Design a protein around this ligand. Structure first.
Ligand code: 18O
Ligand code: 18O
Ligand code: 18O
Ligand code: 18O
Lengths: 810, 810
């Protein structure tokens, strides 16, 4: 049907149809009479996956023959979403499969909806890893993602009585067609035990062993025939485990719990032993695999020439002392050489400055679980502090500030400090974030080793986040500038030549309208919720956090409602305000925010005076597959975190690429987005970082804002008095108390500017032609935010490897 | 190579080779450079399984169209062993696959060794179910085996320091190519809760729900294109289970533990809650599935015309009150009609008379776990006892004897009594066993309802137990009488015409010698144990139990050793005495018997005076795949249980079919084997049932035997004094004490006759020609013991269906 979706050749369609029928018969053991829609999905998945196999084998064979430097991306999170469409896109099979299924009497889009998200991540950090794997494959890098195969991913969110309920995400229930178990590469991981010192060095003994079984998932590049590997480890008990008899077998569950479930905290640290076990488990199994592959190329001098390890936050920080352990204890290298190799091998990416998100492991936990690693960490710390002492003689406070060991009630290891000491490069994820790292939380480290500190502004893959989720936009773009932009997103700049082109303006607006109609119908069918598709789609989707200020959005929503009630017969630009996102199950305030949103909807959506002019909808179960639907439908992207708190954001970039305008603070990547598009083409409001700092120095007094803004006072009084919870008048007391007395994120301080800026948004939306021209200006300058650019920078400036757009033979 | 293994057509071989290569590539994601022997096994398994699919679908479609009466065989055990060779045999693919793999440069026999046994059974009862499924398919019956998919089957046995160690049988680790998950037929099973009485009857409420997910395994008939189904249930938690958050997800293990592990007790009852849960789980899920299939044919009058349920022992006895529950509580049938349907539907097979093996569930367990079933059982008992009271007025002791409810310290439900009351047929598994049921333990029930009591002598499938494990014997037989005997084993009688045929005698003896050489080499390679292949192979393989009297075998072995030591330069017929079998992990005496056997070996096998004249080997990890190797190699089959204790035995029949002579008591099926072959062609010794009874009446005094048999006294003194355990002189005190003072199985009473009978065996073995002629007489009369005969009898006399040898179209 549409060009960017590839060719539907006679030969290809015929072949797909017969392979589809073969799988239905031989693989699913069904015929057309008993086959369910799920069977049809599986037959298609198997049919498509067959096309990956030859390329997957030949890519890995290529890397064996050429022996390039290998990149190991270590993450506890890979937020992959669905795989079927992505695979078809990258293999140019989409139109052929659409035709083949059509001729079999099936609707491919319906089949696509059956696939579970691989929800092995919480949010931005997890999805960043996924985008990165796609870009690394597209850029022909010999890259491997290593993580954990969680049996349960991020929980499915249900809204009951306006409250979040969690249910287990049993995503493997029907089997995963996109993985291959690799039991022959099963590796032992050690826990507990004790350290013995011999004549011939330290030895870690009396350990408990858990097996790490790998599962390989293919990562196809965009039409370059490259298929890289994501290897995820699953925990398995050894067969003599606990080996009255019955209980010993049942106790195997204890070992296997390691890979059972993803911890559902976004930007928050919980010092739980099971989490520590997961972190070591992925690190220990991965490093053995790396070394095995390296030996099958004795001399570890060349190790950093053949291996790069990227640490996605501090979660896999134990790679540093684990590499030291292997090199020193097992390979018998001297400390200084082992350390040189380690530093040259590892690089660390920081993803947050929020203090509650930083990993600080109690010493007593490491002592019990990983006694040898603790000793190695102490030694690293001693040698590191000796360097600090020589660089800054007499500066005793610097020594305690920089120590990997934090003194206090409970001694803790600062994992961030460990990562900086043991890495040749440390990067933040947006220019302002990286500057804040050098200026504030890692200032001491920057002063010691300035050369280590870099920026690598985040990006998103334009395969998933344009071609896949918004084929209509991808097509009208390709009609004008060709298809090359899909793997060279900077080419979108050519669209600036069409900003006055009446045909293009009409087409951009038409694609948006179609996306909105499609999403409005999705809402009715799957959720019985009715919306006006001619309204401005005002969307804030992201994890629920105080720093992300969903609460500020709520205050705007109530302001609009109160203004309508005040002057009912005055014209207002109609809005559909959509807010979605999961709250961490232990995060009370986030759960209260969700309840507030639904409570506001309950009042607003049933007020006859309001009509279809204002609707407030909570988007349930926000996840990658939902993002792919709502983002193309959005008009307005809410990116309203307090300046200095969102390290980068990536949702922001997704919206920019898909034709929504942005209202946001100068925070994270918003700054660079505004710089690329021009500040005139962005809705910027609120305190800058410096303004926040000034306010902190003076002391933030929320009462002052309450006293001086009558519209804000009204809202607080409505909240307190029970306007939004009539049968439970004090329901929102915690929220009011926080806003009034303990607001770390200064919701009130940005309120006036936010509302005024929102008025400017509504004014522009009244003029469809000028709204769309500004949209074109955003899409046209969104090129910098491709993860291909990001990965090319990692490759050149950190990993020391050149990307290649060259095809492997088919 | 050999005829019975089928044709190796040019077309077939070419096709197998390309499908093998296809699976290696697309299924295993390997090429020949990296492929391991396990990959090669899997490629072959997938290649062979492809041939089942069309027949499997068309068999089930056939049953839907024809709607025959369906047979449901309910068992907690299916001891299947390996599936690859069995499938090739039944599909006539063995020579084609052998040729295809040969041309690919692979040895098929080596690949076959890679497959794990499906070890979902303990011993005879579990393997009986497996033989039965094979026969039901071969006889064209619309039959389904229903059981539990245990994640862990019978433990792997390791011998360490002469002691049994258990390790988890993680048989699913590499995946099972012979199953298809059927998540669309997932069903809820209820536990706990409470009973509410309404105007509209009883209701079972507030239950905990566990999901039952079915996995289907094909059961091919012998060359008739019939493929039946074995459906095994796996336990799954519902997604809102326990739904702080992390623990709730980890707690899902509690629900799923139901299908985790097979209870490893052979002929012994342990009243554990988890076992009860397993029993109800299989019953509840199965009955819902049966009813669903029945409705997709309102009127339950026709239920018994369309459904037979066979209860394999009392393990699935809850089917009776579960059927009543569904019919009465859910379908709203009156009690009397529900009961009529239930009785006409269910039949019960008893597998033991040992009192410690009988299931007697504490009332307090049923009260908590299955409150509604307890009420139904009480009601069944009341109505049943009212019938007894009317039939035998005034006989109050009969009333308490026949009650389903046992009074005492803890009230218990006698599950055997439940099964008799609720079944239209009750059968024992060999003529003497069925007679003992009517005469002793179920005498009261027989007097009340004589028509219910039947015999169905056990059998074994000649596919696995001749063609598969002994192709050489199968071939020399087919050369003379054709191939028809494989599904009509009575035809073996034609071999009586060859008892004087010199060519046949030579061939029978040659096949045995080859089998012995092959097994002697298996022992050296896999276990570094060296044996004389010219010795008599004296084999006792079966679970370790006091009733099976491995101890009596031990006493014979020591007698032989002592006699050799006494007269070292006298000629004796050389023997290799092999004993193997697992002990239940909690059964102390059985574990001591294993230690004794290894301890005897340690002395005997290293005595220079003995030389190669006597060797004692403990066969480690006895299981179906090992049986297939050792049974064809055996000369002498030890079947030496105390008369009246082995209900049937089936190992006995396996040996008879494979050319071993039998030394045994007149117990279980041995009686019918001797009757078929002629008592002159059997080595019968020892007390009959009546002699045991006489001895019990008088009182068994072991001391009397010790006092009068000097050779027996010597052995006991050697055991006591530490002759067989020099560094632990009292190691075997428990064994001596048991033999001397508390021997329920009268080991000493059969000792003299046993030893004398063993002398007669040795005498015959000295004359190879006459040994072999007697062997031919055994093989020739082994036809009765085909499970095809057994199943044809069940079909005609219990299930009310006619077997059919007619082919379905290919
Ligand atoms: O994505 N690709 O390109 C891909 C992935 C896998 C294969 C081959 N796969 N081959 C096997 S046998 N896959 C198995 O399938 C089971 C579910 O059916 C899984 O539970 C199991 O973990 C997995 O190993 C081939 C291609
Ligand atoms: O379960 N635990 O214990 C856990 C889980 C996750 C975290 C941290 N999660 N951290 C995230 S998701 N960080 C995000 O990273 C994105 C990509 O750079 C940025 O765009 C974004 O600004 C930033 O907030 C911390 C602890
Ligand atoms: O024996 N036959 O005839 C047979 C059995 C199965 C199939 C088709 N099978 N098709 C699938 S997708 N099999 C899956 O495979 C996984 C391991 O790879 C298992 O873990 C999983 O339980 C199983 O359902 C086809 C034929
Ligand atoms: O784990 N639990 O709780 C358990 C397991 C098994 C049993 C009983 N297992 N019972 C057996 S294996 N019975 C056997 O049946 C064979 C077939 O008829 C006969 O040939 C043989 O004579 C007879 O002993 C009892 C309890």
């Amino acid at each position: 049907q549409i060009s960017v979706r590839g060719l539907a050749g006679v030969e290809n369609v015929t072949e797909l149809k017969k392979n589809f029928n073969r799988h239905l018969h031989f693989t699913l053991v069904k015929d057309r009479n008993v086959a369910t829609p799920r069977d049809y999905y599986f037959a298609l998945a198997h049919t498509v996956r067959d096309h990956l196999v030859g390329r997957w084998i030949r890519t890995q064979q290529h890397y064996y023959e050429k022996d390039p430097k290998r990149i190991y991306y270590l993450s506890l999170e890979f937020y992959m979403g669905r795989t079927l469409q992505n695979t078809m896109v990258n293999l140019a099979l989409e139109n052929a499969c659409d035709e083949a299924t059509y001729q079999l009497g099936l609707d491919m889009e319906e089949l696509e909806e059956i696939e579970e998200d691989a929800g092995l991540g919480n949010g931005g950090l997890g999805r960043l890893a996924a985008c990165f794997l796609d870009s690394m494959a597209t850029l022909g890098l010999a890259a491997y993602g290593y993580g954990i195969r969680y049996e349960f991913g991020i929980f499915n969110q249900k809204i009951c009585g306006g409250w979040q309920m969690e249910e287990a995400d049993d995503w493997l229930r029907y089997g995963n067609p996109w993985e291959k178990a690799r039991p022959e590469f099963t590796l032992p991981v050690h826990f507990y035990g004790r350290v013995e010192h011999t004549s011939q060095g330290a030895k870690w003994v009396d350990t408990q062993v858990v097996l790490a079984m790998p599962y390989d998932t293919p990562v196809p590049g965009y039409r370059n025939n490259v298929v890289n590997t994501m290897r995820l480890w699953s925990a398995k008990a050894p067969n003599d485990f606990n080996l009255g008899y019955i209980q010993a077998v049942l106790d195997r569950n204890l070992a296997e719990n390691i890979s059972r479930v993803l911890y559902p905290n976004d930007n928050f640290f919980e010092g739980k032993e099971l989490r520590l076990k997961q972190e070591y488990f992925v690190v220990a199994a991965t490093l053995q695999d790396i070394i095995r592959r390296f030996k099958s190329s004795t001399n570890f001098d060349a190790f950093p020439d053949k291996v790069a390890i990227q640490l996605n936050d501090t979660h896999p920080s134990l790679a540093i002392p684990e590499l030291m352990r292997v090199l020193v204890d097992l390979e018998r290298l001297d400390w200084d050489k082992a350390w040189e190799v380690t530093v040259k091998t590892c690089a660390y990416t920081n993803h947050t400055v929020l203090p509650e998100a930083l990993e600080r492991w109690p010493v007593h936990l490491l002592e019990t679980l990983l006694p040898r690693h603790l000793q190695i960490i102490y030694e690293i710390n001693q040698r590191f502090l000796n360097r600090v002492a020589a660089a800054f003689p007499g500066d005793v406070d610097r020594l305690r500030r920089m120590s990997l060991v934090e003194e206090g009630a409970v001694k803790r290891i600062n994992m961030a400090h460990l990562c900086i000491a043991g890495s040749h490069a440390v990067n933040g994820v947006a220019r302002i974030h990286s500057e804040i790292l050098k200026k504030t939380i890692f200032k001491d480290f920057y002063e010691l080793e300035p050369h280590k500190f870099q920026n690598k502004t985040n990006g998103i893959t334009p395969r998933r986040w344009l071609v896949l989720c918004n084929p209509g936009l991808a097509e009208i773009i390709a009609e004008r500038i060709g298809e090359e932009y899909i793997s060279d997103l900077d080419q979108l700049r050519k669209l600036l030549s069409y900003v006055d082109d009446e045909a293009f303006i009409r087409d951009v607006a038409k694609v948006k309208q179609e996306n909105k109609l499609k999403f409005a119908a999705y809402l009715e069918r799957e959720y019985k919720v009715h919306i006006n598709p001619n309204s401005l789609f005002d969307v804030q989707v992201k994890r629920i956090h105080e720093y992300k200020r969903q609460l500020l959005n709520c205050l705007h929503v109530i302001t609009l409602y109160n203004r309508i009630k005040k002057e009912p017969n005055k014209f207002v630009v109609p809005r559909t305000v959509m807010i979605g996102g999961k709250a961490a199950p232990g995060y009370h305030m986030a759960k209260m925010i969700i309840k507030l949103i639904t409570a506001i909807g309950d009042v607003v959506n049933h007020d006859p005076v309001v009509g279809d002019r204002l609707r407030v909808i909570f988007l349930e179960n926000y996840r990658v597959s939902l993002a792919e639907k709502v983002i193309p439908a959005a008009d307005l992207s809410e990116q309203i975190s307090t300046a200095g708190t969102e390290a980068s954001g990536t949702g922001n970039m997704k919206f920019m690429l898909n034709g929504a305008l942005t209202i946001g603070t100068m925070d994270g990547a918003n700054v660079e987005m505004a710089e690329e598009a021009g500040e005139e083409n962005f809705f910027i409001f609120g305190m800058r970082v410096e303004d926040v700092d000034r306010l902190d120095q003076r002391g933030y007094n929320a009462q002052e804002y309450y006293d001086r803004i009558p519209e804000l006072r009204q809202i607080i009084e409505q909240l307190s008095s029970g306007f939004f919870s009539p049968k439970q008048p004090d329901l929102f007391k915690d929220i009011v108390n926080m806003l009034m007395h303990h607001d770390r994120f200064k919701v009130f301080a940005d309120y006036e500017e936010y509302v005024k800026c929102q008025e400017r948004v509504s004014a522009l939306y009244k003029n469809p032609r000028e709204w769309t021209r500004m949209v074109i200006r955003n899409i046209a300058t969104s090129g910098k935010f491709s993860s291909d650019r990001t990965i090319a920078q990692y490759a050149r400036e950190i990993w020391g490897v050149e990307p290649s757009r060259q095809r492997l033979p088919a």
